Design a protein around this nucleic acid. Structure first.
Lengths: 605, 108, 15
DNA sequence: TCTCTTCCGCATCGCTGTCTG
DNA sequence: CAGACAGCGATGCGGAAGAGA
């Protein structure tokens, strides 16, 4: 609240300093931001404690950055951490005390939890609460009565209005409890699903699962994990532990296919007990319990097919023990978020790898599903070898003179097709691919602009893939890339970042970018994170290039596009010039060649 | 087959005034009077004491996979448990000097 | 072998 | 004759862009 | 600045035409 002569807020008169400050490696700002030391001998103990109560926002190598909020604190109580259980240790760990504002905030957040509990039974949602006083003063707003369908006091609530009420209670200072007591539940018989000994659970995976299962009752929340970290395995394990009906929801045809393979590979459950509620193909969804479906079909808004209609009615009627939603970052979408209310589930676990977006709808994920249970440390995984180390880089490609003139001259937005297609980046990518091609490194180019992607591919006569590409040709190209030594590069369009199972690649060039989308960058980055059989963290075998054009709008997006990655700890190095580019022969080595491309670019319209 | 050993050993205890069953590696003495019907006079366990720790026993239950390694009848067929035993012997044989004996539970 | 490229090993900025 | 497989036609989302206030 | 509509590039779904037994 107090501002120094500079921008920083003043806290000299706010909180004191512990005499043994050096022993205590923890800081506590009044705003809730916390700065831990990654060099302290007791760093690990602090890391576990802070992660339990706070959600990371920046975890560079030396000094991590944690901020706590109401959602973060509620999760701590769910795992059994009381206000004194956390504040006492926080004061002990704090090297500068705890400001009263945080103290009262912690007290208010912890006490305002568990008073209101939401339980669904017999397809009816009852807002149970041991304390009756909470309900008495909770019915002041008229929305509650109209929302409601027309000790331990409970009342049934309308199915459709659950989401509206859930967000209302969050700002009402009375969060709802979504814990599932699968251990004590006889209404829905347990499913015959078991985890085979073959599956191996990594220490972070166990910790993420442990945080989800704070007590005998499973907690509904979001577990963010890298795609190469094996987030699919964790989802399977959670379903196996619940031992009740689970409805995994994908986002595309590829997503549903992989999940079924993951279930069979890691779960002993029989093949016949798994169904694919997919329009393209089905396996008698009503017949068995464990099902894999997609947001589009379940949330499909237009006319429903007769066969789908029966399945949809069957899904609505039944009650699901678990509702795994992979790629939760798309949930707050209008159609996608409707699926939450359409189906009934006790705890709706959420998995993903890039929990970031521009529109401030990510915060809704806290109430749409639950608090962010776990968010693995990408840097720590790199040290442990679970994830391939990446030498993130940003190759600056100076714009050719003529190209800039039209780019600056025109105030229209043809520039997206212009600065994405310039000779220097073309030579840069052409040179960059050539260097990696002779190094036996697998390349995965990317480009939002299909027009640029096709032009780059034909000139480099490489197997470019994109949306309307035939499925058969899509598989044929991938198989050659994985197997054929003669080919070690595939030019994938945006479809690559959506969902796929691609072979591990040593490098990932990105000539163009869709825009300032932290999702796409992290989505595309996860492709090379696939750990190799016998690599090492320090070898930096995996690389990532995000080619950009200097003095162009592309730079603004690139800096705005790397915010999420740097927060994890990745350092994006800049490369003004590439050694050996001049000696190596490359296309567009003469003014005429650039002129024809510019004319074609201008003729694009 | 007999069922209780007290029948055949009764004359030894009865005929002789005192019998001392001195043993090494004896599992707890309390069972023996139950198995063999006799009233013991002393029940003491003697612990070897030396200026140097001659013996350093250990028990290994968790493998490199942090997986339970119990040799249960139902767990006998598990390949991973068998893999842990082989790997432990390989590493142990590498460091252990000449002379090592491994005992199993059955020929099969 | 399998050594990192020059433009990644050291800064390529003219400084 | 089914049957599968495949191909148009709707609808949706990410992100940005345009347009008049 | 700002709210509504729209573009380019991706996705899903549901209604209609070729080989093959």
């Amino acid at each position: 609240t107090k501002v120094d002569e500079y921008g920083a807020k003043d806290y000299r008169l706010q909180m004191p300093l512990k005499d043994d400050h050096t022993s205590r490696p923890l800081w506590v700002a009044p705003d809730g931001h916390i700065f831990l030391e990654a060099f302290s001998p007791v760093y690990k103990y602090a890391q576990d404690f802070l992660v339990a109560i706070a959600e990371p926002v920046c975890r560079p190598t030396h000094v991590h950055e944690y901020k706590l909020t109401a959602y973060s604190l509620y999760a701590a109580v769910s795992v059994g951490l009381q206000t004194s259980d956390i504040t006492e240790y926080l004061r002990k760990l704090s090297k500068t005390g705890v400001p009263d504002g945080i103290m009262q905030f912690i007290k208010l957040c912890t006490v305002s939890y568990g008073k209101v509990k939401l339980v669904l039974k017999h397809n009816r949602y009852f807002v149970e609460s041991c304390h009756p006083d909470v309900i008495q003063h909770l019915l002041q707003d008229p929305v509650i009565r109209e929302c409601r369908l027309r000790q331990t006091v409970s009342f049934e609530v309308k199915q459709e209005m659950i989401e509206e009420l859930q967000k209302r209670c969050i700002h009402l200072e009375y969060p709802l409890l979504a814990e599932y007591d699968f251990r004590n539940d006889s209404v829905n018989p347990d499913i015959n699903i078991d985890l085979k000994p073959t599956a191996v659970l990594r220490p972070y995976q166990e910790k993420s699962l442990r945080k989800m299962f704070g007590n005998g009752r499973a907690r509904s929340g979001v577990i963010v994990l890298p795609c190469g970290a094996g987030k699919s395995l964790v989802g399977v394990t959670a379903a196996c532990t619940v031992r009740k009906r689970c409805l995994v929801l994908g986002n595309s045809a590829v997503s549903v296919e992989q999940w079924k393979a993951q279930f069979k590979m890691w779960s002993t459950i029989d093949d016949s007990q798994i169904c694919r509620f997919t329009s393209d193909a089905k396996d008698k969804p009503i017949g068995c319990s464990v099902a894999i479906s997609t947001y589009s079909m379940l949330g499909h808004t237009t006319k429903r097919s007769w066969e789908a209609e029966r399945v949809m009615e069957w899904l609505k009627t039944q009650e699901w023990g678990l509702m795994i939603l992979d790629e939760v970052h798309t949930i707050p979408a209008k159609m996608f978020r409707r699926v939450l209310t359409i189906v009934q589930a006790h705890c709706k676990l959420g998995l993903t790898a890039t929990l970031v977006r521009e529109d401030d709808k990510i915060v809704d994920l806290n109430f749409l599903i639950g608090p962010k249970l776990y968010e693995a440390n990408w840097m720590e995984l790199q040290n442990n070898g679970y994830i391939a180390k990446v030498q993130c880089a940003e190759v600056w490609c100076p714009m050719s003179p003529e190209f800039y003139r039209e780019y600056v001259a025109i105030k229209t937005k043809k520039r997206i097709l212009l600065y994405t297609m310039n000779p220097n980046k073309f030579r840069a990518c052409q040179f960059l691919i050539k260097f990696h091609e002779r190094r036996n490194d697998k390349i995965i180019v990317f480009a939002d602009n299909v027009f640029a992607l096709k032009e780059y591919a034909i000139r480099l006569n490489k197997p470019y893939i994109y949306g309307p590409t035939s499925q058969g040709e899509r598989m044929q190209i991938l198989q050659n890339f994985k197997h054929n030594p003669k080919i070690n590069t595939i030019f994938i369009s945006k479809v690559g970042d959506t969902s796929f199972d691609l072979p591990e690649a040593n490098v990932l060039i990105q000539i163009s970018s869709h825009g300032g989308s932290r999702r796409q960058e992290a989505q595309r980055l996860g492709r090379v994170l696939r750990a190799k059989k016998g690599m090492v963290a320090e070898e930096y075998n995996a690389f990532f290039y995000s080619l950009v054009s200097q003095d162009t709008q592309e730079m603004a997006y690139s800096t705005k596009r790397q915010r999420f990655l740097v927060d994890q700890g990745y350092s994006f190095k800049v490369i003004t010039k590439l050694a050996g580019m001049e000696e190596e022969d490359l296309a567009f080595s003469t003014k005429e060649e650039q002129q024809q491309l510019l004319q074609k670019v201008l003729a694009a319209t | 087959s007999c069922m209780d050993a007290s029948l055949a050993i009764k004359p030894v205890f009865e005929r002789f005034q005192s019998v001392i069953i001195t043993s090494g590696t004896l599992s707890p003495l309390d069972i023996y009077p139950k198995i063999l019907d006799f009233h013991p006079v002393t029940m003491a366990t003697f612990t070897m004491t030396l200026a140097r720790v001659c013996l350093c026993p250990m028990i290994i239950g968790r493998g490199n996979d942090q997986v339970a390694i119990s040799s249960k009848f139902e767990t006998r067929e598990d390949i991973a448990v068998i893999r842990n035993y082989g790997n432990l012997l390989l590493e142990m044989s590498a460091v252990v000097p000449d002379g090592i004996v491994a005992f199993f539970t059955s020929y099969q | 072998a399998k050594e990192r490229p020059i433009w990644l090993r050291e800064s390529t900025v003219q400084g």
